[PDB]
Amino acid sequence: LFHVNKSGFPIDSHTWERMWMHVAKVHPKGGEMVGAIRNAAFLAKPSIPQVPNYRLSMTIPDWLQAIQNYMKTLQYNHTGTQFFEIRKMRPLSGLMETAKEMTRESLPIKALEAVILGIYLTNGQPSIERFPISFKTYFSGNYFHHVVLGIYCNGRYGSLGMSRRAELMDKPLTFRTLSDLIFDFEDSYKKYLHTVKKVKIGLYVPHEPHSFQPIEWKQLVLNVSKMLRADIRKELEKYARDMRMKILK
């Protein structure tokens, strides 16, 4: 499994050599390009993507699109080594500090820190409202998990996130219902012959950055595979109504 940087910055010797051993092992050709990049005297300096700023004139779907293209520009991590250690139960303010230092450094990003970045970017807009979604799925005799960030601006459901695949990480605000969104995710997942087993939905995140409220991820959980989609849709629409009225607590 992919390992996590924990020495702050810069990267310590142990994690450095561990990552290089990992990439040497997995890469079939292996040592040639690895050693070439190690002993490369000069390499092209990557540019710094500029953090976009909210503007009132331009519309909110284009805002979500803009954050999505910036995230795409940030070169999604497939090196197999996390660079910013995240804790689920940690209070929100620590995650805001993590998000702002991550934007300062602008390194490769995975799904969890991608949705944290999305929360950090969208925290400035009371009209926009966002929450997490998680899937636990089954394929090839092993279980895998994925996480994305849903949005409910202007009475419409949309999705942001990251993945090595293309269509599993970005949807627009064009969904009347949350059920249509999650079933679209299920169909895209089936397109790769991966079976979703369980689906989990949390809560709207508070709009105050400097707070200690933790992020909820398990407030709703279903076993999607066993049950027929009608009951799933009914329970999900009940839950969406319970959420947008702020009743759940």
């Binding site: 910055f9 810069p10 990267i11 990439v23 890469h27 390009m33 990049i37 190690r38 490369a40 390499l43 092209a44 300096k45 990557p46 070169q75 991590n77 497939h78 090196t79 450094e105 602008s106 390194l107 490769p108 090595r164």
Partner: peptide, 28 residues
């Protein structure tokens, strides 16, 4: 002084390496 150059080198090499493995995943 040299610390910032170290971060520069680190991000440059890791960016290039990530490009290489993205190409490999395209191969896969």
């Amino acid at each position: 002084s040299a610390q910032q150059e170290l971060k520069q080198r680190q991000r440059a090499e890791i960016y290039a390496l990530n490009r290489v493995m993205t190409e490999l995943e395209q191969q896969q």
